[model samples]
Target chain A: NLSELSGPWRTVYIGSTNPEKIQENGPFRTYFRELVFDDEKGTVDFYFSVKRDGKWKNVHVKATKQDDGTYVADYEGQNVFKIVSLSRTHLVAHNINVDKHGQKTELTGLFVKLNVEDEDLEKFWKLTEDKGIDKKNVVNFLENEDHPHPE
Target chain B: AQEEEAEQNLSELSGPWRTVYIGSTNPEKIQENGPFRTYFRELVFDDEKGTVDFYFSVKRDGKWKNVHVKATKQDDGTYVADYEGQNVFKIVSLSRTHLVAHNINVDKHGQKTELTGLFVKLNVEDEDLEKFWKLTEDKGIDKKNVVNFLENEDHPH
Candidate 1:
């Protein structure tokens, strides 16, 4: 079935209609590190980071698929997100969210599979084993920040 | 302590949860998200009623089918629910984010199998949550044309 898409996916970027929302150090800054889609359950697990109060915080969310194919979940308030496009390599999405303050916001995002060449994959796995690291140690490990840096 | 207190209330456990893995005697038949991937879409535990409304989905024949099972809490603090008309599922462990459950099934032909699964929830913070929605709207992504990764013809099952 369609659950074949279930696996580890990494977020590439998230943009907003409101420019200020995505500006440097903006409160609405977004950074999605990972997404796991459970096709069998029609659910998605999110591993992400957000710019908050001059620092970064790791976050996760579980969204369940609705009858309409959209997913609903609660974080700030209530959010209904839809998949715009998905493939082995890329994903595009649309989300409509209402905050606890009743503020409505809309955005879209892109996600890509975590690709690695055979050699790289082998080396990484070997390294992890050598280091005696676990999935919890390497999961959602981002090498660079999505947030804009000082020039 | 306060967080633990909040966790014990069954009603507080309502939310989305996905199966990370399953342990079964038939390893080949229990591959990840193969024909057996299951998700707990909504779980509501009623204290006064001592019953739980369990909503989930399982993929079959290239589509997702919804399954609802109402489980009643028993005297042993476990839950029992009849599903598929051939089996009863029992919750071995339940928590805010993780669930361990066991089930035994008998097919119409009388074939039997046992399954144990570990389910986990997706957790997110407030600010990141807001940004996820904002980006989707900003991109003007059309929901109708979403990518069908599971049903791609190029990759035949």
Candidate 2:
């Protein structure tokens, strides 16, 4: 159904950007990995990681809703991303990062959900094949919101 | 494509980061780096100046002590800073196992030292954020009960 992405969408990818290190080949790719979400969290949490070269790493991102009709996701303890748009098929957001010297940088990105055809996802895998990610990593389809309480 | 993604970026250097410093002064008693465990503060990063500035306060004898520091990132991605006559630094190193933004301090030119740090942004799941906040709110670590736990209590009263 077209509503598959409505409640929560699961994504398997290679990155998240640092506000200060938003350059194409800079330090942004060094932190980000996967993302899972449900209606209970209200917003998606971006689990990020950076490859120091040969290993997998983890990045912590937490997004909370503000009173001003915006969503802010904090990366580790340093960066925060503001979600701009989210729909049944796409997601867009931006954030800022800084170096130890207090220098600031910004990043913005776009992603499309995989539909029955998965055309957009195919291109992403093709473009980033050399970076350790491929279509083979395609996981499961997203489902409805289930507020499974923890005992 | 990576460059294009980066070019869309306009601000990557401005931030209002919250910091918690851990004390690692005596090898026998200390275990980490940055500020003492009791110190908590906020920071503002400015890109044009190339400096990361922050301030935090620690509790001592029922009183709070606030300290401030600013470090400059060198071409090597290492930051050098001076605090209370002691030289402190933040070195960003990337290894296959981790990307560490560690802080180190030299106490007496060559005698006392500390090495400890924070792991930058991590790969996360969409539910990871929600669950974390949910736990935070459950533990009263965050303000307000945003999660509707009542609806989830369908099994019992």
Q: Which residue segments of model 1 deviate by more than 4 Å?
A: A1-15, A18-151, B1-8, B26-36, B124-157
RMSD after CA superposition, every candidate: 17.6, 20.2
Candidate 2 chain B has its poorest 10 consecutive residues by lDDT at B148-157
Residue B63's C-alpha lDDT in candidate 1?
57
Q: Go through the candidates in order and give each one's DockQ.
A: 0.06, 0.02
Please report the TM-score between candidate 2 and the true structure.
0.32
Q: Interface root mean square deviation of every model, in Å?
A: 14.1, 20.4
10 residues in a row with least lDDT, candidate 2 chain A: A142-151
Tell me the tens digit of each residue's lDDT in model 2 across B1-157. Answer: 3222223111332221222112233443131222343222334465667787755443434444555678786787667887634554653433211222444555544555444432211122244344334433333332321222211111211
- Specify the CAPRI tier of model 2: incorrect
Q: What does candidate 2's lDDT look like per residue over A1-151, in tens digits?
A: 2224532222212122232242223445432223445456566566644444454355555566557645565442355555555655455445555556676555444333323324433333343343333233322212211111111
Per-residue CA lDDT of model 1 for A9-79, tens digit only, reads 54445555555444555544555556767877888887765556776677788999999999998876688
